[PDB]
DNA sequence: CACAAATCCATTGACAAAAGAAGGCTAAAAGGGCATATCCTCGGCCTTTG
C-alpha cells in the first residue's frame, strides 16, 4: 500500500497505459525491499541478498 | 677523631616508538526509476444445449 501510494503520486495518463502496468512496478519493488529489509532477524543488506 | 676515592640521584640530549589524528580512497550499503497486461483447484453460476 505504501508503494502503491508512491506509484499513484507518479502516474501520468498523458501516455495512456493502464494504471496496473505502471504501479505494479512500484508495488513489487516496495514489497521486495520490505522482505529484504525486515524479514531476517540479522539484517543482510539488499545487494547481498540479491547475491 | 682529620683529609680524597667510590657510588646512589637527579638533569640533558638524542631519539626510537606508541599513540593518535587526519586525508584519501574504495567497497559496501542505501536509494531511485522502471510504462503492454496478467497458476492450479474448487466450486458457485450462469449459457448453451438438447
Automatic annotation (TrEMBL):
Protein name: RNA polymerase sigma factor RpoD
Source organism per UniProt: Escherichia coli
Family: Belongs to the sigma-70 factor family. RpoD/SigA subfamily.
Residue stretches in coiled coil: none
Function according to Swiss-Prot or TrEMBL: Sigma factors are initiation factors that promote the attachment of RNA polymerase to specific initiation sites and are then released. This sigma factor is the primary sigma factor during exponential growth.
Compartments, record wording: Cytoplasm
Self-association and partners: Interacts transiently with the RNA polymerase catalytic core.
Superkingdom of this protein's organism: Bacteria
Amino acid at each position: 500500500n505504501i508503494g502503491l501510494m508512491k506509484a499513484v503520486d507518479k502516474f501520468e495518463y498523458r501516455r495512456g497505459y493502464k494504471f496496473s502496468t505502471y504501479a505494479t512496478w512500484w508495488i513489487r519493488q516496495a514489497i521486495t525491499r520490505s522482505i529484504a529489509d525486515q524479514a531476517r532477524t540479522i539484517r543482510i543488506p539488499v545487494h547481498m541478498i540479491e547475491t
